[PDB]
Structures are given as structure tokens and as C-alpha cells.
Design a protein that fits this description.
heterotetramer, A mainly alpha, B alpha/beta, C alpha/beta, A: mainly alpha, MetI-like fold, B: alpha/beta, Rossmann fold, 2 domains, four-stranded antiparallel beta sheet, 9 helices, about 35% helix, about 15% strand, globular, binds adenosine-5'-triphosphate, binds magnesium ion, Nitrate transport ATP-binding protein (chain B), Nitrate transport permease protein (chains A, D)
């Protein structure tokens, strides 16, 4: 009996779905409404995913699955690296003061700007896409973990100081359980940034994968142009929603 | 009657395979201006019962009535001295008391409000530390500012949860005074949770004695027949003083 | 010879200038002694014992344990914090088990597990072994810290008001248990008490500190009673009821 | 006497600056080193910024300032919107459960995918670029604020409940001072996202501004191609570093 956890999402989904339709009543609003969006792409895509038409036309089932393995590998590496680095940076404030700026200046680089740099570093262009995902969705995990460790109450540290809790024992018994909201919120933001940089990351691979489907649909302006990308974004959000609740 | 309790019965879920009954069938009537102590064993339900009167806790079955209206939410006329002192670490001693008396007395020209804060700091003797954060205080020092902000609001009903636990002999005795005269000068009814028998008899008019263990109920409501003006010296000289004191220790021993 | 405090002092940098807490405290605590440190609230009892536990570096001075300077907290100097520092994500059983496993991991499970179980029964939190600190009362929080400290059985015990939030029956029961484990081993106990009756019953020597800034040790006493002290008999001796009011005399004289 | 706050950043700056040069000893590493990056772009760019040689060729000072005025308005709107919302959704868990999914699915949208949607909604392309910056750098501010409010200790709530603290006074006296590490961490991440989507955002405006300079240098390959974008990223990072310490 979930009447306050499954129904309010649907009630809230009613808004932003009807007012979106009413927003199209303005003639200047060229964005297609839910009726137009879900009917123009209904026949080839919404009817059935997982269909192959040769070349790279794989509908949307394979496009969201091919990019899922790219963001999954990129986020997993960034989650591991971000958490370990954040804990190490959170302790030893001299180290945090040591690499403070070269982490700040390196986290403002757009993924599109990472595209040529990663090409030169990795001359395969297959792991280059992984690096763009990894280097983009790592700072929210790194920053939140670092702030979480720095905000540990002195009461827990005093308990750790009296006992011989240092090293792996200190991190697994004091640092991690205390900084649960910070680390998991960083992972939550990191999940969104992995998908936020998939269009740029998949600019070096074939036409299979969501992000290549978005890119070439944006370049080619057709009648069913905006509807195709909007449906792709919905698929990304739903997949990112399941990844969030995990 | 001023505050009355019909049939409060607190049940805690304990999600994994249990059902804890902290309280059951508590009947108690407190008249206006009366000082009531709530002595008992540690972990028997003194704070849980005290919180229900305050409104921070909701009774499962039953209710608490205050002046004919049901209690269902915390209110400034029921200020509570929290056992953990619930201090705000980003505010100084003066600011912690200031936060308390700024909403109860809105529209006071900000001139009298400063005087109220300062003179209540005088009562607990924290003048030399009004600019210190709770992180740079002591346990007893943190307790005094907790009661300083509670007395500044002049509640109709005052709820005290171990207000003198972390105080030494002189300060606790000195702070026992300036509390009964506020209850005397202003029409303040006080419900106090204490573990010191020698101070329960000095302050209270009757002593509510809870029962140890789960499903706690009110054991005895024995009252002190001592004159209201008390100076902690002649009250001991009363022949009945020791008789009540040994009665308190008697019931506490039988609950072992 | 065992624990030497050599002219330590504490200066706290404040925005209004320097604040002096400690000034020229000297102590010579021998192995196995029981010392109760009493005084006013905010005089520096917690600050003085913090340096012995290693939580506070003296501004000018040094503390030696067996001819070795103290600079970092250790498990042989276990402390009972005044705020009862407990991890909210652990149970009462897990809070005690954390200290047991950390200070000696050599022996396997079902042996260090029994050490935790017996110490919870010693303080009486047998039923409260699966609930978080948010589900236990303040006095029950206190006994978790006591059980956590007693399980390690350190070389020297430092207690900062370990019986503040306990009733008379429970407090007296834990005093006897603290004494029993104090004699069966070589534990040196440094205890802070706000109750004069408590210090005389336990301590071999009672130390008082003057109030206000620049607090130094004044009028250290000795407690000449037979080692197996028992209640209802230590008060019968003529050496009681005159040492007690001597302590009250100093506490009341330190005011102003 | 800043010996452990200014010196360690420069000591840590030596690393990643000499190993970067040492990484170019490998012939397979086509990325330019620090010496050639700071020499190829030395004459026209590093010698003097703020030089105007025609439209879309306004050196680098105007490029880093035209984009600064775009992210400044975008981040300010997102900072206000995220904080005010994060408090509102942070309290009232029914509202948080109500719009949980429509925010998760709306925060995985890449800024490049927001480009066609913004044009359709805003047929001016001037505020549409601001919308891309605003909608991208708002979720870390929103997510951290909601987590911070949800993690407010019950002791502070109890003090606010006993007193008549509710509404504006409750937010400015309890919610905000307690949730300082959470809100400010989100703002720091939000600053990084404003510069993270500046290349995509300026795809609809003229050639002035960083992001247009990055894009057109990536499309056209020259001898000083990778060096120019690396120098531009350094300017963005230093500006972001100044904005971070604010
Ligand atoms: N970090 C600090 N900064 C400034 N002053 C401090 C700091 N810690 C303690 N003090 C001051 O030191 C004095 C004594 O502190 P301490 O905690 O030792 O008191 P106490 O007498 O042991 O406590 P209790 O009230 O429990 O008896 C107080 O005036 C307090 O304000
Ligand atoms: N949320 C909860 N879940 C389970 N049990 C709880 C919860 N809150 C309180 N209890 C239990 O119910 C009883 C109520 O505790 P309470 O704080 O009222 O005791 P107390 O007599 O005031 O304690 P003390 O004298 O130690 O301060 C205790 O046994 C406590 O362990
Ligand atoms: Mg309690
Ligand atoms: Mg103290």
C-alpha cells in the first residue's frame, strides 16, 4: 500500500505533461507537445525497440544499451577513484591545500574540450570516450566526499583517536558510515553527469549509442526532428532513474 | 486543573521483531502554579512522559489536555530544558538565549529584549562567556545556558529534564533558588525530572514516582507537607523530611 | 613515578585576547590510586584531564606516564567523555564491541563477544543491546560509555562525570562495580565528580581546583578509610561528616 | 607567512607540469607539452590579451569575459532557484516524493541535447544560451540542498519546534546556518557546471566568447590547434578558481 510514494509521482507527472501541451497553444512555441511528440515517433520507435535496419540504425533499444556500457564503465571508475581520492584528500589538510587549484582548474573543462585532448592521449578513440565520461562525472563524487570527511563531528574522531583506529580500519568504521549522505549525494550527481556528457563522449565512435543518435538528429533538421531527441531524452532519464535507485 | 493526562500509553515500533511498551495508563492532574517532580529509574520513561506533555511526542492511545484544549504540537508556553541541552553550535551564549526570547516577545523595541537576555545570563552566571560558542563551553556551562533561554520566555508550563545534572554543589544549590521564586513570583507550573532526592523534596509539591521496566505506570504521588518558602536549611530540620526521603529510597530499592 | 603532571598550563586564544584556564598544576598519581577531581562548573576539570588522556596539548608544561611524555591519545588511557560520544549508526552492543575489537584483535569471536555481553549486563543494558543511541535515554547512553571503557580495562581510567544522569540506586550499583574492577586489576582511575558524597566513597585522594580563570590545585585531601569501603558504614566513621563539609567549605569559599 | 597554503599549490603544480612534459617523450603521445603549448600560443595570445583584429577574433580577454557574463547570469539564476527549491523540496517530504522522478529524468539531459529544445521554446537564441547554462548548473545546488535539509539534526528541529519558528524565520535561522556545508558544496559544483556547458551554450551566438573559440578551433585542425584549446582551458580554470573562492 504505497499511496504516498507511487501516486504523487504520477500526480506530479500529470503536471508538466498537460501544461506542456498548453504551452504549445502559443503559436511561437515551436517545441512539439506530448501528443505530437508521442505520435510522430510512435510508429518506428515507440511501437518496438531492439530492431536492426543495417548500418547504425538500431532504433533505441541498442542505442541506450550501447551507451549504458560506456557510462557504466566511466562512472564505476570515477566512483571508485572519486571516493578513494576524496577520503585521502579529506584527511591530511596539507594534501588538500596541496592539490586544491589543479583540481578546480581541471574540473571546468567541458567534455567537448576534452574530446581533442583525449584523442591525442589515447590513440584508439575507444577508451577516449570512457575518459570523457570518467573525467566529467568524478568531481561531484570527489568534492562531496572531501567535504563530508572534513565535516565529520569531533565526537566520532575522539572515539577513533582513543582506540587504535587508523588506516583501513579508520576509514571502514568511522569515515565511511559518518559520511554516507555526502558520498551518496556525490554519486547521485555523478550519475547524472555521466549521461550529461554522453553526446560529447560518443562523438569518437560509430553511430550506435544514445548521444550519436542525439547528435546526428540535431544536425539533420526534419519534420520528426525534435520528437526523436525528446523521446531519446526520456529513455535516458528513465535509465538514469533506475541507476539512481540502485 | 491546569494540565491533565487521561490515559497516555506510549508504544514504540522497534521494527525488527519487537514491540516495546515504554508507558501505559498514566493518570495525572497538575494544578496551576504547582511544582511536580518526576523521579524514577534511568530509562523507565521519565523523558518520554515529559515529552508527551511538551508536545514533542505523540501518545499512541490517550491524550494530554492543557486548560481544556488538547496538546498536539510544541508551543513556546511549554518551553523545555532538553537533556542534551540542544544548543546551536553557530550561536554564542548570548545569541542562544537571544533566539529563545525573540519570538515569544516580538514587538519589544529590541531595547528591553537585550536587557532580558543579559539579566537572565546573570542568573546562571555566564557573563564572562556570553561571546563563546557551545564548542568552547563545558558540560555544566552548556546546561546553564539551556535553562537560561527557557526561563527568559516565562512559560505558563515549564518542563525540566535533568536541569542540574552537570552542576556542582554551590551552583546547583544557587540555581535551585531563582527557580522557585520565578515559580512563586510568576504563576509558573513546573514539571521536573530529577535523579537527586535531596532536591526533589526542596522544590516539588508532590513527587510522581514512576515504575521501573516496560509498561511503566505511576507508582506513588506522595506529597511534601512543607511550607512553600524553603531555604534548603530548615526543610531538612523537619521531622517529616527524612520520612519522605527514606520513602523515596524505599520504592527505588524495590524496583531493582 | 607513575603519572606526573609537571606545571602544565592552558591558554585559549580568543578574539578578545588570551584566556587562561590552567596555571601551574602539579600532580603525582601513583599506580593503582583512585583520584576524584571536584570543583566548580567551568573551572577546568575537563581541560586538566584532557591532557592526561592526550586530547589537549598543554600550552606550557608536560604530562608524563611512567617517565614518558603524553602527546597522543591511546587505548591504555581510555576516557569516558562527558557528552557520551557514541556512534549513532551502531547499537549498544556494537558500540562496546568497537572498542573491544580495536584494542585487542588477537583472540577470535565468541571470546571477545562474551566480554561485550558481560559488560552490558554489568551496567544493566542487557535488554537494550539491539537499539541505536537515538532509541535509548540519556542515562542509558551513559552506561554504554561506561561499558565501552570498562571492557578495554585500560592501564589508567579517566572519567568525566560518569554517573551524572543515573538514579541513586543505579549510580550506587555502578560505583561498587567500578570499585570491584578497580581492585582486581592495576587500573588507576582519574574521576570527575560533582557529588561530594561520591568522591569520598571512592577516591583515595580528593583534588579541588579553584574557580575562575587561572585555576590551580588548592587543598588536596587524603581519604583515610579501609579499602573495602561500603555504604551505611563509611558515614558512621568519625572521619566522615567533617571531611565532607571541608569540601563544601572550599566550594562555597571559592565563590567571588 | 603563507608557507603551507600558497607554497604547496605551487609545489603540487610542479608535478603534472613536468610529468606532462615527460609524458610527451613517448612518440605515441600526440598531446603538446607545456613548453610547446606555451610557445606556439605565446606570440599572439600570451604576449597580450584584449587585442581586436576583427569580429570573432577579439583575442582572449573578451572571449573569457563574454562567456563570463553568460555563465554569471546563468549561475545566479540557478543558484537562487536551486537554493530556494532545495529548501522547499527539502522540507515537506510529500513534495519531495511528488517531484522525485521528473527532476531525475530532467537532470540527465546533456547540454547539447538542450540546444534544440531551448531554440524551440525561446525563439531569440540569446536567452536560450542562458537557459542551457541555468538548467545544467542547478541540480547539484538542488540535490545538495535537499540532502542537507533532510540531514538537519533533530536537536535543531526540536529547538525550532518548541519556539514559534516556521516559514521564513525557520529558514534563515535554522535551515540555512545548519546546511552551510551542503549548500556551499553544491554551489562549488554548480560553478564547475556553468563552465562545463559553455561550449554547447555558445553554439547559438556569435564567435565571441570562450566556447566558440573552443568549438571552431576543434573543427579546424592547424599546427597550433591543441595548444590553443589547452591555453583557453587554463584561462577558464583560473577564472573558475577565482569564482570558486567567492
Ligand atoms: N576550546 C575552548 N576555547 C575557549 N575556552 C574554552 C575552550 N574549552 C574550554 N574552555 C573554557 O575553559 C573553562 C573550563 O572548561 P572545562 O570544560 O574544563 O570545564 P569543567 O569545569 O571541567 O566543566 P563542568 O562544567 O562539566 O564542571 C571554561 O571557562 C570554558 O569556557
Ligand atoms: N524510539 C525509541 N525506540 C525504542 N525504544 C525507545 C525509543 N525511545 C525511547 N525508548 C525506550 O523507552 C524508554 C523511555 O526512555 P526515557 O528517555 O523516557 O527514560 P528516562 O527515565 O527519562 O531516562 P534517564 O533517567 O536515563 O534519562 C527507555 O527504556 C528507552 O530505551
Ligand atoms: Mg531521558
Ligand atoms: Mg566538562
Amino acid at each position: 500500500f504505497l499511496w504516498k510514494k507511487v501516486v504523487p509521482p504520477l500526480v506530479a507527472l500529470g503536471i508538466f505533461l498537460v501544461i506542456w501541451q498548453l504551452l504549445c497553444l502559443n503559436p511561437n512555441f515551436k517545441l512539439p507537445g506530448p501528443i505530437e511528440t508521442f505520435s510522430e515517433t510512435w510508429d518506428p520507435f515507440i511501437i518496438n525497440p531492439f530492431f536492426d535496419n543495417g548500418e547504425s540504425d538500431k532504433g533505441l533499444g541498442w542505442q541506450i544499451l550501447s551507451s549504458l556500457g560506456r557510462v557504466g564503465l566511466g562512472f564505476s571508475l570515477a566512483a571508485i577513484a572519486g571516493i578513494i581520492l576524496g577520503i585521502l584528500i579529506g584527511v591530511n589538510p596539507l594534501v588538500y591545500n596541496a592539490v586544491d587549484p589543479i583540481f578546480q582548474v581541471l574540473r571546468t573543462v567541458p567534455p567537448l574540450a576534452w574530446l581533442p585532448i583525449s584523442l591525442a592521449a589515447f590513440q584508439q578513440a575507444n577508451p577516449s570516450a570512457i575518459f570523457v565520461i570518467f573525467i566529467t562525472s568524478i568531481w561531484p563524487i570527489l568534492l562531496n566526499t572531501t567535504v563530508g570527511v572534513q565535516q565529520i563531528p569531533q565526537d566520532y574522531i575522539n572515539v577513533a583517536k582513543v582506540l587504535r583506529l587508523k588506516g583501513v580500519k579508520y576509514f571502514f568504521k568511522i569515515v565511511f558510515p559518518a559520511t554516507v549522505p555526502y558520498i551518496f549525494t556525490g554519486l547521485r550527481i555523478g550519475i547524472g553527469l555521466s549521461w550529461l556528457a554522453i553526446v560529447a563522449a560518443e562523438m569518437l565512435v560509430g553511430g550506435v549509442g544514445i548521444g550519436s543518435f542525439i547528435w546526428d538528429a540535431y544536425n539533420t533538421t526534419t519534420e520528426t526532428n525534435l520528437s526523436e531527441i525528446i523521446l531519446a531524452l526520456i529513455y535516458v532519464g528513465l535509465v538514469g532513474l533506475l541507476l539512481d535507485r540502485l | 486543573t491546569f494540565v491533565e493526562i487521561d490515559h497516555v500509553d506510549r508504544i514504540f515500533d522497534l521494527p525488527n521483531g519487537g514491540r516495546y511498551i515504554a508507558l501505559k495508563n498514566i493518570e495525572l492532574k497538575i494544578k496551576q502554579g504547582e511544582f511536580v517532580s518526576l523521579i524514577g529509574h534511568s530509562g523507565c520513561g521519565k523523558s518520554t512522559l515529559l515529552n508527551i506533555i511538551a508536545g514533542l511526542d505523540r501518545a499512541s492511545i490517550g491524550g494530554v489536555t492543557l486548560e481544556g484544549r488538547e496538546i498536539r504540537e510544541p508551543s513556546p508556553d511549554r518551553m523545555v530544558v532538553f537533556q542534551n541541552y540542544s544548543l546551536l553550535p553557530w550561536l554564542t551564549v548570548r545569541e542562544n538565549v537571544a533566539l529563545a526570547v525573540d519570538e515569544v516577545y516580538q514587538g519589544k523595541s529590541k531595547g528591553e529584549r537585550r536587557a532580558i537576555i543579559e539579566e537572565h545570563i546573570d542568573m546562571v552566571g555566564l557573563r564572562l562567556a556570553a561571546n563563546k560558542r557551545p564548542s568552547e563551553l563545558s558540560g555544566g556551562m552548556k546546561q546553564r545556558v539551556a535553562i537560561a533561554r527557557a526561563l527568559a520566555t516565562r512559560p505558563k508550563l515549564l518542563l525540566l529534564d535533568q536541569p542540574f545534572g552537570a552542576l556542582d554543589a554551590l551552583t546547583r544549590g544557587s540555581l535551585q533558588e531563582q527557580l522557585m521564586k520565578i515559580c512563586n513570583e510568576h504563576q509558573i507550573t513546573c514539571v521536573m525530572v530529577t535523579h537527586d532526592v535531596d532536591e526533589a523534596l526542596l522544590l516539588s509539591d508532590r513527587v510522581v514516582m514512576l515504575t521501573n521496566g516496560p509498561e511503566a505506570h505511576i507508582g506513588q504521588i506522595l506529597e511534601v507537607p512543607i511550607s512553600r518558602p524553603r531555604q534548603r536549611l530548615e526543610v531538612v530540620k523537619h521531622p517529616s523530611y527524612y520520612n519522605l526521603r527514606n520513602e523515596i529510597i524505599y520504592f527505588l530499592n524495590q524496583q531493582k | 613515578n607513575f603519572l606526573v603532571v609537571e606545571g602544565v598550563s592552558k591558554i585559549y586564544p580568543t578574539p578578545e585576547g588570551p584566556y587562561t584556564v590552567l596555571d601551574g598544576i602539579d600532580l603525582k598519581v601513583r599506580e593503582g590510586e583512585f583520584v576524584c577531581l571536584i570543583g566548580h562548573s567551568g573551572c577546568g576539570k575537563s581541560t586538566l584531564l584532557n591532557m592526561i588522556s592526550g586530547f589537549n596539548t598543554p600550552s606550557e608544561g608536560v604530562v608524563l606516564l611512567q617517565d614518558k611524555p603524553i602527546t597522543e591519545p591511546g587505548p591504555d588511557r581510555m576516557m569516558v567523555f562527558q557528552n557520551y560520544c557514541l556512534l549513532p549508526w551502531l547499537n549498544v552492543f556494537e558500540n562496546v564491541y568497537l572498542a573491544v575489537d580495536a584494542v585487542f584483535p588477537n583472540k577470535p569471536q565468541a571470546e571477545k563477544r562474551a566480554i561485550v555481553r558481560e559488560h552490558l549486563a554489568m551496567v544493566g543494558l542487557t535488554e537494550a543491546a539491539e537499539k541505536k543511541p537515538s532509541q535509548i535515554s540519556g542515562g542509558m547512553k551513559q552506561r554504554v560509555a561506561i561499558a565501552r571503557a570498562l571492557s578495554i580495562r585500560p592501564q589508567v581510567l579517566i572519567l568525566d562525570q560518569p554517573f551524572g544522569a543515573l538514579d541513586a540506586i543505579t549510580k550506587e550499583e555502578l560505583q561498587e562495580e567500578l570499585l570491584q574492577i578497580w581492585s582486581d586489576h592495576q587500573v588507576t582511575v582519574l574521576m570527575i565528580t560533582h557529588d561530594i558524597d561520591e568522591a569520598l566513597f571512592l577516591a583515595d585522594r580528593v583534588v579541588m581546583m579553584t574557580n575562575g580563570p587561572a585555576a590551580q590545585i588548592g587543598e588536596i585531601l587524603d581519604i583515610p578509610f579501609d579499602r573495602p569501603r561500603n555504604r551505611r558504614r563509611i558515614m558512621e566513621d568519625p572521619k566522615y561528616y567533617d571531611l565532607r563539609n571541608y569540601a563544601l567549605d572550599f566550594l562555597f569559599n571559592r565563590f567571588a
